[PDB]
């Protein structure tokens, strides 16, 4: 009987993509408790999960780290992390000595999680949302910070993790990422209700729009205007756009050939499209790849370079890989028209489905955590 | 395999249900639950996905007297009437997505009906201590054998499989015998609360009444239970009720706690007594953490969970509104819990008959199977 206490990065999506290990713990019989800052709270508790309470795009140096610019960017997020995780260390501490926790189910980006468990000696499972590129730069800050603390308190430095947990196709992975064990991805996008028209193909060449409220808080409208006008101008096109309710209202004089999606997990309807055109967010991204449906790629920050890079070097889809391409309508317009002509992109995106449904599933994870807590 | 789940159009219902879904999901199958208006929230809740759809009364426990046989037909006649009129809605929704395994409470008879007309297995759900032998099943036979004999069926089809998380000591001794299933705590999501993880000097007593319970009786079950609480000397009430019956609690002690929207699993192993309706998630949360309850039972299958829970030793029943309303009753079943330690043991007793059923994750393979 484990108590696993689930330390996220404080974005929505990060929590996401821990959410069906967190079911599998807790319908294999164990107890789970999300630490979530106000930024989270309703992400965990819209999952059914309970809390414990805590408190320029787009960017191609991301994708970049053998350059000084791209080191810079990662450096710094390092820095970030690692003076919030000082910062926030006292309740964490509170909250462990309170709910005793037997393991630590850790984002690979929240350091707290790590520093966490050196200092209360309890095993730390890191998990990855999806490609990793946090080796060199932002792993070789967070050190720079952190093994001064872990060593005064009786360590070597900030403590390798007991098992990194990777539902990234190998395929995709980063070069430079430790190896992790295999967890299949299993879609949560949220929830939400089937609709009717979710249920068939129609005539129409059926074009998934989704991208999420971070990616879109922080780049502004526009990629999805961008994306809405090359959809919604090639013939034969139906655009199913599913972005979140606050930015809906960024789609004026919306197209005929468009419905706007009303909160509805992208697995619910995502069978029916031949394209996803998004920003490489790893819950879109991986759901469509699981189901064998190729994406356009519009990267922005953090991991989406990479991503869509390999994607594409995967034959699985188009990446537009800056600014100039994104906002190229014409070529934008007939990398649509090239995925939608050939069958060779779904076929390849279908080869990384399967090296998903290659992995264990969640609920066989559950023994390996077992043995590890 | 793709699951729709069909449940009765009651939150606690789909609660009961909801770490089968979940572990259905975490290993890889699909999950759809069928929702009235009524279950939505419930079901989003839950991180789940839906299709829309469009008192005491100790009768409810003497199915062998004449109102206890009438309250336990009309259930069924309620429910029949219901499925029959829903039928071309849930026929049109199968249409849609297709399932291949229906997973349905054992009292939503729409259920099994379309499981018979689909020619598809139904897994039955019970949600705890089972009591529609005799009476409800005798009369959902009498009322839908007809239209399933229409459709070339022998009638009411038996389903494929019934699981139930009700430990064995506990149950009704007609039910017939199901796929044991372990009983994981579901009530909603929320946040831990800074005292419910140590014990206190006071003696803790919870009291969980619940929404659906408070909306048939109004407040007199749980005021009566704050009243004989509170008397006793060295007690502290943690008191969790919806939002809504919050201001109901008029004059606590300066010790008491209100516990608005925290699930009981949070907080419970550091309290000494529950006292509820009972079945429920409350009552086999209760019971899987080994804290006895006092139980003032109201409705359907709550006098039998009262009675049982009462004959294993775990806890003690008020069986009637003659019981209920006397307030020395009341008060002195609760010193009697808080002054012998062998209720605790016999409540400790049957969470090792839960936690020797195999999980929710384990029946995965049963239902593909
Ligand atoms: C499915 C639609 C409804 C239609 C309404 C009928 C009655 O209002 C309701 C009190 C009832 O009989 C029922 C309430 C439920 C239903 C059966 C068993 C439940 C055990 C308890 O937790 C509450 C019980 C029953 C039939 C019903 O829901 O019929
Ligand atoms: O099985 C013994 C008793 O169990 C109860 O559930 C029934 O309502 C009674 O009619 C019966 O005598
Ligand atoms: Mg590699």
Same mark, same amino acid.
């Given at each position: 009987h484990? @108590?696993?206490?689930?330390?996220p990065?404080?974005?929505?999506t990060?929590?996401?993509?821990?959410?069906?290990?967190?079911?599998?713990? #807790?319908?294999?019989?164990h107890?789970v408790?999300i630490?979530?800052?106000?930024?989270?709270?309703?992400?965990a508790?819209?999952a059914?999960?309970?809390?414990?309470?805590?408190?320029?795009?787009?960017?191609?140096?991301?994708?970049?780290?053998?350059?000084?610019?791209g080191?810079?960017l990662?450096?710094?997020?390092?820095?970030?992390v690692?003076?919030?995780?000082?910062?926030?260390?006292?309740?964490?501490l509170?909250l462990?000595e309170?709910? @005793?926790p037997?393991?630590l189910?850790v =984002?690979?980006?929240a350091?707290?999680?790590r520093?966490?468990?050196?200092?209360?000696?309890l095993?730390?499972v890191?998990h990855?949302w999806g490609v990793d590129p946090?080796?060199?730069?932002?792993?070789?800050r967070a050190?720079?910070l952190?093994?001064?603390?872990c060593?005064?308190?009786?360590l070597?430095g900030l403590?390798?993790?007991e098992?990194?947990? *990777?539902?990234?196709?190998p395929?995709?992975?980063?070069?430079?990422?430790?190896?992790g064990?295999?967890?299949?991805?299993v879609?949560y996008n949220g929830?939400?209700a089937?609709?009717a028209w979710?249920?068939a193909?129609?005539?129409?060449? @059926?074009?998934?729009?989704c991208?999420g @409220?971070?990616v879109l808080?922080?780049?502004g409208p526009?990629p999805?205007l961008?994306?809405?006008?090359? /959809?919604?101008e090639?013939?034969?096109?139906?655009?199913?756009?599913?972005?979140?309710?606050?930015?809906?209202?960024?789609?004026?004089?919306?197209?005929?050939?468009?419905?706007?999606?009303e909160?509805?997990?992208?697995?619910?309807?995502?069978?029916?499209?031949?394209?996803?055109?998004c920003?490489g967010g790893?819950?879109?991204?991986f759901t469509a790849?699981?189901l064998?449906?190729? #994406?356009?790629?519009?990267?922005?920050?953090? =991991?989406?370079?990479?991503?869509?890079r390999?994607?594409? /070097?995967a034959?699985?889809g188009?990446?537009?890989?800056?600014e100039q391409?994104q906002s190229?309508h014409?070529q934008?317009? *007939?990398?649509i028209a090239?995925?939608?002509?050939?069958?060779?992109?779904?076929?390849?995106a279908?080869?990384?489905?399967?090296?998903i449904?290659?992995?264990p599933?969640?609920?066989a994870?559950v023994?390996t955590?077992?043995?590890?807590?």
């Open positions: 484990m @108590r696993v206490l689930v330390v990065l404080p974005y929505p990060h929590l996401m993509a821990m959410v069906p290990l967190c079911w599998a713990l #807790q319908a294999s019989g107890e408790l630490a979530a800052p106000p930024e989270l709270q309703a992400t508790h819209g059914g999960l309970t809390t414990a309470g805590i408190r320029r795009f787009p960017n191609p140096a991301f994708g970049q780290r053998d350059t000084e610019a080191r810079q990662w450096e710094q997020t390092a820095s970030n690692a003076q919030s995780s000082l910062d926030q260390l006292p309740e964490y509170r462990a309170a709910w @005793r037997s393991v189910l =984002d690979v980006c350091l707290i999680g520093v966490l468990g050196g200092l209360l000696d095993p730390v890191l990855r946090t080796a060199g730069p932002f792993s070789d050190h720079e952190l093994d001064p603390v060593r005064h308190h009786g070597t403590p390798t993790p098992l990194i947990l *990777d539902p990234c196709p395929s995709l992975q980063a070069s430079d990422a430790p190896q064990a295999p967890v299949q991805y879609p929830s939400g089937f609709p979710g249920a193909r129609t005539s129409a060449r @059926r074009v998934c729009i991208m @409220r971070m808080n922080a780049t526009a999805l961008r994306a809405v006008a090359a /959809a919604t090639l013939p034969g096109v139906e655009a199913v756009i599913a972005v979140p309710p606050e930015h809906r209202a960024l789609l004026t004089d919306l197209p005929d050939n468009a419905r706007i999606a909160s509805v997990p992208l697995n619910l309807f995502l069978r029916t499209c031949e394209l996803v055109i920003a790893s819950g879109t991204a790849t699981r064998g449906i190729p #994406q356009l790629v519009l990267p922005q920050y953090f =991991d989406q370079f990479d991503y869509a390999n994607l594409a /070097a034959g699985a188009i990446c537009l890989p800056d391409a190229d014409e934008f317009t *007939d990398s090239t995925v939608l002509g050939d069958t060779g992109f779904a076929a390849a279908i080869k990384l489905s399967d090296e449904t290659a992995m599933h969640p609920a994870l023994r955590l077992e043995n590890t807590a």
